[PDB]
Amino acid sequence: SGFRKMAFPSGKVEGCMVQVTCGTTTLNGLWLDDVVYCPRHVICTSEDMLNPNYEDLLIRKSNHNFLVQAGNVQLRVIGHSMQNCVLKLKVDTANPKTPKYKFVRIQPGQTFSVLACYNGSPSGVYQCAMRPNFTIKGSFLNGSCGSVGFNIDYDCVSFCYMHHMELPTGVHAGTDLEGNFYGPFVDRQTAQAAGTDTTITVNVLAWLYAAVINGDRWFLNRFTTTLNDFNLVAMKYNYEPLTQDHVDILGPLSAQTGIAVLDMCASLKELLQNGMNGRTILGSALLEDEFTPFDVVRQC
Amino acid sequence: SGFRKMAFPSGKVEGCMVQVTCGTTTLNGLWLDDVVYCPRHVICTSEDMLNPNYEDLLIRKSNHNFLVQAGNVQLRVIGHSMQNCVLKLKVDTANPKTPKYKFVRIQPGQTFSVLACYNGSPSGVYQCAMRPNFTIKGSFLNGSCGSVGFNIDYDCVSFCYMHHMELPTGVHAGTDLEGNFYGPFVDRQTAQAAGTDTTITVNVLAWLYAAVINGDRWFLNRFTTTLNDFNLVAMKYNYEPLTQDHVDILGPLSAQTGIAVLDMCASLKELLQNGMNGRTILGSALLEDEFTPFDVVRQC
């Protein structure tokens, strides 16, 4: 079969991307029904971003200060509000290309597709993970702010992420579509720090199962181990602690491959303690943590 | 900014994917204007695939033997022909969602986006490279045959690849949209072999430039070298030989980073001769050859 990092098809979301301008500042928005969602920092200059009072900046703006452009065609703004760190611009027109959608706050370790945009135009799509420290490792130039992350199930799009900023360290922070940040981040240009980025253990195990399925299994060993003792090793290598929840989520992959979860944990232990020794697994010389168990099943 | 493997937005191509059935056999097709393009092996059983005479199999089939389904809606087949290894089914209806398009035969080392499908339904999109031996390393289950590869420029889609088969070794072969195979492959279930898979040198250099731009440059050395002497080292590590064409293509990246192409070739030489020594470049522990110079510019 083979094994690739794979985004959801982006066409349903392409139809919702718009440009929003307010002063010089232009960025991407999401047009769903008769509402445009965008980062509230569209109302800031570069000067304001050091110490913005978002109340007082927004109080200067009326409905006509916002220029929403959908391809060639401008929308009329008949209502604005701020919910947390998102701006909700009410427009005259319902989007004809609105898919079935929900807004979801995802958990760290979950994956999603990102459509990266510039002036309301999609340019690229990729699959990523929400890191344990609530950052993402993305591609976001200037003009990409308000680029969005999603999952697709049936023909329901679940919107989980809006891009707001690059932190001084070059990693990325953003909100849900209710405008709450993931992590402790704020929409201001100060020195903000993420915690230690750990590896998502359950995703690693999932990927090892994907490897076995595809015929890569040099890493399978004789040993087994315990949950308890696995976690001591996990602590030392900055792996997330594995729980019984995690074990249960791997059960289908366990069933398909004939390998018990603790036997796979023992394989991993030895890769942590000895390294990969120059060899590769599914064409990679590192342990990949950016596929959930669900993603491996979907693909397999 | 950051740096990801990034597919083109797939929405323009989603609108062209259909199911084609002929006997039991079902696979994906591409509906452009009033023509459906699909792999000619849709007319084969599993038995036929050992030694198919495609003339004689097709001669048994009339127009009504082909069941083209577009979502819920069936098309009427008013003409069939075989061009090389593709079947061209003429239909009654022009596709309303036909984008501006061309068919292009790409060269080895060029990249494209793939939309992987099942029964005329897109499920996933990823970026890949045509390898020097004309194979691709893909994700293709049963039912994915006639999944398509493309590039997008402006709003022109350039269709360059149709998936036909998995070779015994688990790599993938397919055609252009004129039905000529890339490589020496045939659409039959025999033991077929690809040549030695070499690394695409110019793509590696492009990626090193991407690394420099993003602030990863531990690998930059004091040395320089010659084209001639670089290639001797390239030969030993199964890298493609670098030409003056290649040097010229890197000139914009050279201009932006302030590093001459031969100085970068010298960096690479030392990574080949010494390895990466456990360190990473743009989060990778191997040298990536799946971004062209154009891709790095597009993204940067």
User: What string of H, E and C letters represents the secondary structure of chain B?
Assistant: CCCCCCECCCHHHHCCEEEEEECCEEEEEEEECCEEEEEHHHHCCCCHHHCCCHHHHHHHCCHHHCEEEECCEECCEEEEEEECCEEEEEECCCCCCCCEEEECCCCCCCEEEEEEEECCEEEEEEEEECCCCCCECCCCCCCCCCCEEEEEECCEEEEEEEEEEECCCCCEEEECCCCCECCCCCCCCCCCCCCCCCECHHHHHHHHHHHHHHCCCCCCCCCCCCHHHHHHHHHHCCECCCCHHHHHHCHHHHHHHCCCHHHHHHHHHHHHHHCCCCCCECCECCCCCCCCHHHHHHHC
Q: Which of residues 179-218 of A touch B (CB under 8 A)?
A: 214-215
Active site residue A16: no
Burial class (CB in 10 A: 0-12, 13-18, 19+), B290: middle
What are the CA-CA distances from residue B130 to residues B13, B186, B236, B252 (Å)?
A: 20, 17, 22, 23
Resolution, in Å, please? 2.1
The alpha-carbon gap from B214 to the nearest alpha carbon of chain A, in Å, equals: 9
Answer yes or no: do A9 and B7 touch at CB < 8 A: no
Which residue, chain included where needed, has tokens 């031969």?
B262
Q: Does B124 touch chain A (CB under 8 A)?
A: yes
Element housing A128 (H / E): strand A121-129
CA A151/CA A102 separation, integer angstroms:
10
- Residue from B151, B146, B126 nearest B137 by CA: B126
What are the CA-CA distances from residue B55 to residues B24, B44, B58, B84 (Å)?
A: 19, 11, 5, 11
Which residue, chain included where needed, has tokens 């007082």?
A56
Answer yes or no: do A11 and B15 touch at CB < 8 A: yes
DSSP-derived 3-state class of residue A23: coil
**Residue A196 CA, distance from chain mean position:** 18
CA B129/CA B290 separation, integer angstroms:
6
Give the chain B residue nearest A216 (alpha carbons): B170
Test the B interface: residue of A3, A4, A274 with most B CBs within 10 Å: A4
Q: Does A121 touch chain B (CB under 8 A)?
A: no
Q: Crossing angle, helix B261-274 and helix B201-214, to 10 degrees?
A: 100
Burial class (CB in 10 A: 0-12, 13-18, 19+), A187: buried
The alpha-carbon gap from A139 to the nearest alpha carbon of chain B, in Å, equals: 5
Test the B interface: residue of A10, A128, A145 with most B CBs within 10 Å: A10
- Residue from B157, B32, B36 nearest B96 by CA: B32
Rg (CA), chain B: 22
The secondary structure of residue A281, as a DSSP letter, is B
Number of Cβ atoms within 10 Å of the Cβ of A151: 19
Answer yes or no: do A124 and B7 touch at CB < 8 A: yes
- Residue from B262, B249, B268, B251 nearest B211 by CA: B268
Answer yes or no: do A1 and B141 touch at CB < 8 A: yes
CA B69/CA A56 separation, integer angstroms:
56
Kindly list the residues from chain B whose CB atom is less than 8 angstroms away from the CB atom of residue A5.
Answer: 5, 126
**Residue A61 CA, distance from chain mean position:** 31
Chain A, chain B: beta-carbon pairs less than 8 Å apart: 114
Look at phi and psi of residue B18 and say left if phi exceeds 0, alpha if psi is from -120 to 50, else beta. beta
CA A91/CA A73 separation, integer angstroms:
13
The secondary structure of residue A16, as a DSSP letter, is T
- Residue from A130, A112, A148 nearest A38 by CA: A148
Give me the sheet containing A77-83, strands edge to edge: A73-74, A67-70, A17-22, A25-32, A35-39, A86-91, A77-83
Q: Does A285 touch chain B (CB under 8 A)?
A: yes
The alpha-carbon gap from B179 to the nearest alpha carbon of chain A, in Å, equals: 23
- Residue from B195, B25, B152, B216 nearest A14 by CA: B152
Answer yes or no: do A116 and B214 touch at CB < 8 A: no
Domains of chain B: 11-175 (2.40.10.10), 201-299 (1.10.1840.10)
